[PDB]
Design a protein around this ligand. Sequence first.
Ligand SMILES: [Mg+2]
Ligand SMILES: [Mg+2]
Ligand SMILES: [Mg+2]
Ligand SMILES: [Mg+2]
Ligand SMILES: [Mg+2]
Ligand SMILES: [Mg+2]
Ligand SMILES: [Mg+2]
Ligand SMILES: [Mg+2]
Ligand SMILES: [Mg+2]
Ligand SMILES: [Mg+2]
Ligand SMILES: [Mg+2]
Length: 69
Amino acid sequence: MKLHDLKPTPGSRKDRKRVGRGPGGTDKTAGRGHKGQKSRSGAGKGAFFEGGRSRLIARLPKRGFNNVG
RNA sequence: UUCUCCCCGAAAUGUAUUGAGGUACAGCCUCGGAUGUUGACCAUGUCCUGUAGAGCACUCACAAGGCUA
Ligand SMILES: [Mg+2]
Ligand SMILES: [Mg+2]
Ligand SMILES: [Mg+2]
Ligand SMILES: [Mg+2]
Ligand SMILES: [Mg+2]
Ligand SMILES: [Mg+2]
Ligand SMILES: [Mg+2]
Ligand SMILES: [Mg+2]
Ligand SMILES: [Mg+2]
Ligand SMILES: [Mg+2]
Ligand SMILES: [Mg+2]
């Protein structure tokens, strides 16, 4: 058939965010707002009072059956 | 921190922080889905309040006389 007339399903393919690159969209700061937002990123489940700091009740093992309703 | 036009559009508040020009959560923005008038204004009904004013009935302050250990 027409290898030139292969067409990807509309949708599916979508273009990448090219970030820097102009006051036509997402200019100077690259979607980042003028901040203490700077390259070498550091943290993901942390603030400093942590509060995932509730207490624990603990067993080690487990074992279980395959189910056949 | 570099190419274009189109649509919407904020925050500089709260609480926490060896925290205070940083950060977490919330708040406020946008997008898609769901409901689908529950939103907005203004009206009537109803309930709550101690400010403006005022007043000395209590507390404190206080002006001229009277009576008076
Ligand atoms: Mg864009
Ligand atoms: Mg800068
Ligand atoms: Mg670096
Ligand atoms: Mg507009
Ligand atoms: Mg507190
Ligand atoms: Mg701060
Ligand atoms: Mg947030
Ligand atoms: Mg929506
Ligand atoms: Mg409603
Ligand atoms: Mg209504
Ligand atoms: Mg008054």
